Amino acid sequence: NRHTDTHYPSLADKVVLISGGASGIGRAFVEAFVAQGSRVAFLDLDAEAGQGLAHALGANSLFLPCDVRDIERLKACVAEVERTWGAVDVLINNAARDDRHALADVSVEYWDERMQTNLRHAFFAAQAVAPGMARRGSGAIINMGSISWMRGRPGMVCYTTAKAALNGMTRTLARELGGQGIRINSLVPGAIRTERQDAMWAADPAGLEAASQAFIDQQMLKFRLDASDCARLALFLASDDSRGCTGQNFVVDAGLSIQ
Amino acid sequence: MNRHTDTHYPSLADKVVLISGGASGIGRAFVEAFVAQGSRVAFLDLDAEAGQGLAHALGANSLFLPCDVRDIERLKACVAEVERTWGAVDVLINNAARDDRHALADVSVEYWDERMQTNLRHAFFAAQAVAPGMARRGSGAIINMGSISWMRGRPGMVCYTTAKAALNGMTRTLARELGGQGIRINSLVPGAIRTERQDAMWAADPAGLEAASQAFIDQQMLKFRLDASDCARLALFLASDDSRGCTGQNFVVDAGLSIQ
Amino acid sequence: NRHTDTHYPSLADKVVLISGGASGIGRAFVEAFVAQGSRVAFLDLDAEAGQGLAHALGANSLFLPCDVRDIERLKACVAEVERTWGAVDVLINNAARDDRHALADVSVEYWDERMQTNLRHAFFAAQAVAPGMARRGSGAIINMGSISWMRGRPGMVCYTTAKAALNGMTRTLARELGGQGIRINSLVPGAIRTERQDAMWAADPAGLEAASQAFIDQQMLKFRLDASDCARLALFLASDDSRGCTGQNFVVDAGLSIQ
Amino acid sequence: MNRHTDTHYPSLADKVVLISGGASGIGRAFVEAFVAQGSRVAFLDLDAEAGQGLAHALGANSLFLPCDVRDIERLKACVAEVERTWGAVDVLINNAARDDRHALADVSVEYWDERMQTNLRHAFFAAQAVAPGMARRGSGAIINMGSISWMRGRPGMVCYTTAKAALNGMTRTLARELGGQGIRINSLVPGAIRTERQDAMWAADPAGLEAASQAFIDQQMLKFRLDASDCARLALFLASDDSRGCTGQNFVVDAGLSIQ
């Protein structure tokens, strides 16, 4: 799975590090950059899925097991990529947990855990890759955002608050690191069809279909987005074709955020 | 006692207002302004001597609670006590924050966690605490203090600016989550506010203070310095019935500094 | 009709100039500022309605007939207010025409006419009031905006494009005039119930009610906004309580723009 | 012939692209970049000698039409001619504009009207002209050239910045109006782009040019000057199938100058 027929020569050999890379959207990033000839390291909690995917993709892929709550382990993972391949060229902060939770019912421990799996690792990963980027004079960071806080969507307050945090963090880190040659942008998907979003309804295909159609009806473009649409955008945001873009959101949502 | 405005909002009289970080700077100006409108104002602060001092000045319609907002249990205890004394909160202002500077490369996990606790976490928990009483009544208002710093991509204080950007999003989603219960939530987003605390920080460099002040004036569209009263004027409006149809929105009081 | 029980001493005696002031939202502005003790001049195409309203409100109101397409006449109207009462303190650019029109069917003459009635007069009114404001060292301008272009609403492309134009014009005029002491903001309503929005369905009360309920269902707050909600916000944006606010949008829409 | 990128978009081959203000500066870079991808590129310009010159360089997959975009009849005639030659437009880029400076107090009605005609009106009429052919096919893309100038509240060019803000809104509403017919509309929003035309304007003040250039670099987050190729890189992406799910959106290429 190439995800596109477009060919970016500027991606060849680049070292790309993707958190949450073994399944879903992060898997599509891993696949797309490997297809462009990048050297792609990815982290995931699921060791069996990660190992499977790196074995399938071969030697220009590198899977490291990592719980992104564990910042020591995250830094260990970054140092290991650096020792294997040199400074990271492209970091994609993608790891997230989007489970539904009622506002009235969130405990302090729940809040902490969700901020940690959704927001904290993205700061520490940027902090880890930065010195290597600055030594070279170039690098790019892509924070996965979400239109859900833009549209004020209820029922997952920690996830949407974390994603809004990353919106801010892109803008300030863009200024703080830009003088070192690092560009930082957010890739902000709409409602992406995934095997996991679909697994949730395995005995209500009426319900799945109805919910899918509702997104199509609300969207401006009348087809379902998928992980390839996200990977198309990530390739552009990593390539030299976006060398002067920083501090910005790039939204791939078929119009769902403008209703 | 300082009024902050000559405007009179009859809709503010008797309302129960709760302001975190209320004993100094901006939060102090909110406490003063609502007391002057005849509200029943409870406020939280770490500084007990400052808190006790401010409540001494303002008298019996003010109520000072010692609270470390990092302690969520104590935050909820503070809210429960206000409720038992005065009835459901009408107006919550999430104002407590810590804006110390810190280079990205210097931030440890411990520091990050502590700043998220002081800057962001309490604001959710306070809204969570006041909401059920507001919903029982059918009405209420929440003001999250935001900041133009993340909009302007300001460097060198990543934990503060990231917490502030977080609250921008939390305003929008809680506005949907609670609107059907009659609660409106908006963010009050100040520019560069002159305070005695920001000014105490240069007490041996008057040249430097004045230079920095003028730099704000030159960057701003309006050529005077904003102060705490400007923030309090806006807060009275966001709490009053004059803003009853407004929710999920930023209201920015910054003399144009965010548009340069 | 006071529109509020709030009392702004800083509005007393201020000279307020409102375009489209004889009916609908602009009428509510005229009423609210007269109640605060302002000296309120207003312009409208409807001379009979304008004369009626100024006669009812008495001597601190002043109605001038004006077709806002006619910029000569607009400037004449401004000069006359200035000669009567002195420099304008508060300008509200409110005149607009929001009729529904299909994209596919707009002619060049239609486009021109709609840009002229929706956008052009707001620039020329600001330009007319500015020198008087600057002489004094203070003044405020409120451009009526609209959430319709934010929500990408179709079927009235000239109206929504004009309102988006005014969004920009607020920001740039705020910088260009701010050094003279003039603050410029946009007041951006959501779906405001008016006698005119309602007159459109005088034999389909089912249809009116259904459409009203649809706004309530989409809104975050579950009640209909009306012209008083807009006038409450205008009073604040004109008063000294907003002296340091400029360049900004203030949206009064019950959450309709965030869905 | 200048490629602007080494990237290869097979989805651009044979597509029919139509660019207003195409014979100089940025629009010239778009014309060049799409020709290099194997598109069939028609472009409009007032400057016939410049247009004829550029089409001479680029050869038979380019097509130069003399057009004053103030003449809506001629604009529609230009579109009809492309359609009869090559089939429905796949990609429209609304790029023609005039960015001359003008103090607010200096603007006459005649000037305002003329600048709205040159900066905004044609963009609507071009989208209107290309839309039915795009809808018959089921697909198409529109790029409105926007500007960070109104976002940054830049003074002294009110007609230009107001027209640009207009196009920001027109992107969002046309995206809803046409999306169901398979057409996506987005705005490409450049920062301070170095061009031979912006540079010709200082040919006797090299100090002044360099000073102004460095001021952009100091204000930007990225410390190099953007050029027309940066805009063209972004346009290829917004026209290609790689952006097929993107619509109603701004894509800003400005090295951070809009966030200060």
Residue numbers in the entry:
A (entry chain A), C (entry chain A): 2 to 260
B (entry chain B), D (entry chain B): 1 to 260
What do the authors of the reporting publication say about this deposited model?
PpSQDH is a tetrameric enzyme belonging to the short-chain dehydrogenase/reductase (SDR) superfamily with a strong preference for NAD+ over NADP+. Structural studies revealed a homotetrameric structure in solution and crystals, involving cross-subunit interactions in which the C-terminus residue (Gln260) inserts into the diagonally opposite subunit to form part of the second shell of residues lining the active site.
To elucidate the enzyme-substrate interactions of PpSQDH, 3D X-ray crystal structures of apo-PpSQDH as well as binary complexes of PpSQDH•NAD+ and PpSQDH•SQ were obtained to resolutions of 1.7, 1.9 and 1.9 Å, respectively, each in the I2 space group with two molecules in the asymmetric unit. Size exclusion chromatography-multi angle laser light scattering (SEC-MALLS) analysis detected a dominant solution state species of ~119 kDa (monomer molecular weight of 28,000 Da, confirmed by LC-MS analysis), thereby demonstrating a tetrameric assembly of PpSQDH in solution as commonly seen for members of the SDR family. PISA (Proteins Interfaces, Surface & Assemblies) analysis shows that the compact tetrameric assembly of PpSQDH subunits buries a total of 13,974 Å2 of solvent-accessible surface area, which accounts for 29% of the total surface area of the oligomer. We observe an ordered region with a higher B-factor (residues 195–218) in the crystal structure of ligand-free PpSQDH close to the C-terminal end, which corresponds to the extensively documented substrate-binding loop of SDR dehydrogenases.
